[PDB]
Structure 1
Amino acid sequence: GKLPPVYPVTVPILGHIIQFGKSPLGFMQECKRQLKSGIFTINIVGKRVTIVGDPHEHSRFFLPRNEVLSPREVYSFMVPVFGEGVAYAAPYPRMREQLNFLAEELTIAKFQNFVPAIQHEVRKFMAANWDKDEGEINLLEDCSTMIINTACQCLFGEDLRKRLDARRFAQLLAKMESSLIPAAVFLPILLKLPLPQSARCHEARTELQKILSEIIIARKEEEVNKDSSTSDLLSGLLSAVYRDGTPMSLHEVCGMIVAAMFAGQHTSSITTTWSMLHLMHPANVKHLEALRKEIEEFPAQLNYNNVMDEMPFAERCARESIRRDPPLLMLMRKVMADVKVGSYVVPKGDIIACSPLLSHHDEEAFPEPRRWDPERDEKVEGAFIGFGAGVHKCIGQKFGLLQVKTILATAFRSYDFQLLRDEVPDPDYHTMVVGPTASQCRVKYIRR
């Protein structure tokens, strides 16, 4: 039919990957300018990637059903992490049941207990590691540690955290993470080759499943000897029954737990770090005042109402941090059948993408897009896609923001911070999940 315009390939069989790596946004905006089109196709190692780079057409990426646009093939490289029959490795109907089960473990009703759990871990961390009148820290490392500790304290019973503490859990997860080859998205041959990565991933997942098995057995013993019963994400998923009457296997529960941590860890840490970096910069002193005012009448011990209902401004700070520097640069689907987008047909076999980095820098949608302004609103409806939308919208958004907001309120109640450079850090685009440049994240905390 009428295909999107294709950016010229001048270096064959790499395509535009190299140019993309150098300046993701600059490159994408150059394609947009040159091809006179928000919808255009680039070439990544010989694979056509059609970018829906016009915010007016977002719904064409986000709304079509799975039969039409499917992320499953994109996620083939993560099958060893999730496990077979888990998440994108399951038929879509089955994945949806699993997602519902996960969301039910992050229901608003469970937030009643999450708030104190999170604040407990935050205080404990600050008391241990931020103990002088002032001191120097790497904010990105400290927020990452807080997020693993807080997520674990919400989601895992004490017995589990004893057998599998944050530190050990992070090691297992990092071993799985460092075994991933996202290049396999564009070079699918990799997924059929024998790779040492495969054995490491399996080692770590099996080790984790073993620990969970031993926790389940121990809990059974606790219940028999005392009436002690632990209610957590583990117990919750284990009690799940699919519509076909079968229960979730331990294999599936393990994969879901792993998948949840993989989703939640970096994104939440990065969002918290950016938010603090912005709030502490002198240019944003008005915003820091608005935050401090928002939390001023909060009890020493926050509760569900405080964080959920009484923090709209902290929430704006979080979303605008994601809006300016989205941790996920490119959302992708396999085109399963020709799809009409704007004035073009995107053909079966393409990878279709929608880029939060590109869309969040559209100047009609977000005037002066490099300026962090929590008071802004999108000027094109649906242009903010920080948490995705439609069929595959984020199910962790509320829990992620609960942690970010709780950490912001707890940190800024007791500390000020000073950046150790003139400007907030540059984003570092070399990672799967993009955050501020780590070596630029050293800051000074100052006890209030």
Structure 2
Amino acid sequence: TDPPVYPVTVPILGHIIQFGKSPLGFMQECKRQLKSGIFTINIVGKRVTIVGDPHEHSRFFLPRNEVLSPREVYSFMVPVFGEGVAYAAPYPRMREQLNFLAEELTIAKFQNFVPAIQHEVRKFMAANWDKDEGEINLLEDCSTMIINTACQCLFGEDLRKRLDARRFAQLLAKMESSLIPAAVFLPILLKLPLPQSARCHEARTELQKILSEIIIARKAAAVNKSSTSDLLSGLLSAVYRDGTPMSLHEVCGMIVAAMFAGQHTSSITTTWSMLHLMHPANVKHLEALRKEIEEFPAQLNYNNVMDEMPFAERCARESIRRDPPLLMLMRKVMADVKVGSYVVPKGDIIACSPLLSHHDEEAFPEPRRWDPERDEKVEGAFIGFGAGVHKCIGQKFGLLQVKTILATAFRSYDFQLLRDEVPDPDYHTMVVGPTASQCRVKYIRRK
């Protein structure tokens, strides 16, 4: 009933090395060598059981927090969140907070988002992509466009007059760099007096100082009468099941969580999308994206992007499908849980790996081939946005952003990969994207 452990060859470290050197190869190798889709690996002394069979995805995504907990495994994120916030808070309270954000990101809030986005893309374009052909780093540029377009959508004008996208990014970077992802396996690390923790602290107390100055100016305004909502006001008016409103630091915590969530996954999804579409091997697909946009006004609207872009959407999904930005979703097992024909014991870190599952040959024939036209051959094998009790809550907003960019970008430009092949993914980051140094691309305006 215990799933097969893969033979340890390297004393205390376990497989931490041959994992990080090549996560996909190493997992595939495991799946084969143990003639089994469900297996256990060792990472610095900790048992990590991987649910690598797509037919078993529901055994990971559906059990409740009390059985499969995210708290313990995602605690290295307390820099982003703040100390008693998101996964660090009790489950009832965690749920309320994420629900408040979730309702702040529903399609019902997008009435004004497409123009917000389009404005910010064009403004980036007509300041950095403004020659008749130039050389840029595409990941970096998309990454900048996405932070700007996210702020424009979710921050009101009063907010952005004090805290523009450039300054939010800068603060966010300072907090982001405090993250030690190895802490999932070596929690001792979260106790080291590292100097990148002072920097994170300093940026958080600066973010809160500014938001507080904003809330005061908002309340002064509201007495002399009284209008226009955003992420902030929205959270600012959430009431918990108990009597009480959120505190500044929880409001702020959810804001930085929302923006960090979006910044990387969406950029990378955009970057990959465009790298794929620009590749000469996918002319047929580029052509299809162009036929899709062909009849659109210069100023797109809600319906253009939500309801009339199913081929750009497939492009995003497929990009995520082939090169998932989140490689391993994780939970600490709190009770023996059945999985396949196996029992996974209390104390195991249990993972489900979009990387591994999205390259299952039954589920996704020719996995390294990018093919928007495709569909999963096994039910619920695509888990790029997760599933279950912790489904991505920003999926729609993310894709709204990827699509609108693809739309605006390709309308006005072509691109040339300065390279024979699409970039190698770079697994050495917390959120995975194409290799930065390989993402230089020549833009070309359009006659």
Q: Which residue of 2 aligns with 1:259?
A: 257
Single out whichever of 4-13 and 147-156 deviates more from structure 2: 4-13
- Equivalents in 2 of 1:45, 1:430: separation in Å? 17
The number of equivalent residue pairs is 444
Contact 1:62/1:389 (8 A) holds in 2 = yes
What whole-Å deviation, never above 9, does each CA across 1:304-337 have from its counterpart, x for those lacking one? 1000000000000000000000001111000000
Instruction: Please give the secondary structure, in 2, of the residue aligned with 1:246.
Output: coil
* 1:141 CA displacement: 0.7
Question: Structure 1, residues 347-391: CA drift from partner, whole Å, max 9, x if none?
Answer: 000000000000000000000000000000000101000000001
Name the CA distance, whole Å, in 1 between partners of 2:192 and 2:436: 33
Shift of 1:222: 3.0
Kindly state the Cα deviation for residue 95 of structure 1 after the two structures are TM-superposed: 1.2
Aligned-partner Cα distance in 1 for 2:416–2:23: 29
Between the aligned partners of 2:131 and 2:223, the Cα distance in structure 1 is 47
1:151-196 deviation digits (Å, cap 9, x = unpaired) = 0000001121121111111111111111111111111122344443
Partners of 1:80 and 1:135 in 2: CA distance = 38
* Alignment partner, residue 121 of structure 2: 122
Partner Cα distance (1:159, 1:141) in 2: 27
The whole-number CA distance in structure 2 between the counterparts of 1:157 and 1:409 is: 25
Deviation at 1:220, TM superposition (A): 2.2
2:308 to 286, 307, 310: 310
Question: How far apart are the structure 1 equivalents of 2:258 and 2:347?
Answer: 29
Map 1:168-317 → 2, pairs under 5 A = 168-225=167-224, 229-317=227-315
**How far apart are residue 85 of structure 1 and its match?**
2.4
Distance 1:83 1:178 in 2: 14
CA contact (8 A) 2:424 2:434 kept: yes
Greater Cα offset, 184-193 or 383-392: 184-193
What is the CA–CA distance in structure 1 between the aligned matches of 2:243 and 2:311, rounded to whole Å? 45
Distance (Å, rounded) in 1 between the aligned partners of 2:210 and 2:437: 35
1:22 Cα offset (Å): 1.1
Q: Take 2:192 and 2:144, find their aligned partners in 1: how far apart are those partners?
A: 35
User: What 5-or-longer segments of structure 1 have no aligned partner?
Assistant: none
Give CA deviations for 1:185-209 in whole Å, capped at 9, x if unaligned: 1111223444433322221111111
Query: Do the aligned partners of 1:58 and 1:382 also contact (CA within 8 Å) in 2?
Result: yes
Q: 1: CA distance between counterparts of 2:355 and 2:262? A: 19
Matched-pair identity in %: 99
How far residue 67 of structure 1 moved from its aligned partner, in angstroms, is 0.8
Assess if the C-alpha contact under 8 Å between 2:358 and 2:364 holds in 1.
yes
Q: Deviations over 1:231-254 (max 9, x none)?
A: 211111001111112011111100
Unaligned stretches of 5+ residues in structure 2: none
**Are 1:139 and 1:443, in contact at CA under 8 Å, matched by a contact in 2?**
yes
Shift of 1:225: 4.9
Is the Cα–Cα contact under 8 Å of residues 175 and 201 in structure 1 kept in the other structure?
yes
Q: Given that residues 222 and 229 in structure 1 are in contact (C-alpha distance below 8 angstroms), is that contact kept between their aligned partners in structure 2?
A: no
After TM superposition, the score normalised by the length of structure 2 is 0.98
Bigger CA drift: 381-390 or 104-113? 104-113
Q: CA deviation at 1:81?
A: 2.3
RMSD: 1.1
The 8 Å contact of residues 136 and 443 in structure 2, kept in 1 or not, is answered as yes
Displacement of 1:224 in angstroms is 4.0
Distance 1:357 1:333 in 2: 17
- 157-166 vs 359-368, greater mean Cα deviation: 157-166
Aligned residue for 1:74, secondary structure, equals coil
